[PDB]
Ligand binder design. Structure first.
Ligand SMILES: [Cu+2]
Length: 123
């Protein structure tokens, strides 16, 4: 299955956001990060990444494709807008092995606010 996440300056959900900010996926799924606005990218939050998964960091203003096969939680940030809370979360499979790391990972205050809102969607 494919998924689409827009990178926005000012969405309904706030300034500097991934929309949707939470994605439920299954192994083999493709997630496309789309620059609806300029100034954004996507980068893994190394504290919120499943076992095996290579770090990644996309170029500003471009699309990025993330293929997910390892189960668990994948935390993503926009590199220049992490401080402003531009973070997202992908859950692959059901109960995630790295749930607690996501709950406790150090990040800027607005990022932690948004990450907590995302963690509440964990199915
Ligand atoms: Cu951004």
């Amino acid at each position: 299955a494919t998924h689409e996440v827009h990178m926005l300056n000012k969405g309904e959900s706030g300034a500097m956001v991934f929309e949707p900010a939470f994605v439920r996926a299954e192994p083999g799924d493709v997630i496309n990060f789309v620059p609806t606005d300029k100034s954004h990218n996507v980068e893994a939050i190394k504290e919120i990444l499943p076992e095996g998964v290579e770090s990644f960091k996309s170029k500003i203003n471009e699309s990025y494709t993330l293929t997910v096969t390892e189960p668990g939680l994948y935390g993503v940030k926009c590199t220049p807008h992490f401080g402003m809370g531009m973070v997202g979360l992908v859950q692959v499979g059901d109960a995630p092995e790295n749930l607690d790391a996501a709950k406790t990972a150090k990040m800027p205050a607005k990022a932690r606010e948004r990450m907590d809102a995302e963690l509440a969607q964990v199915n």
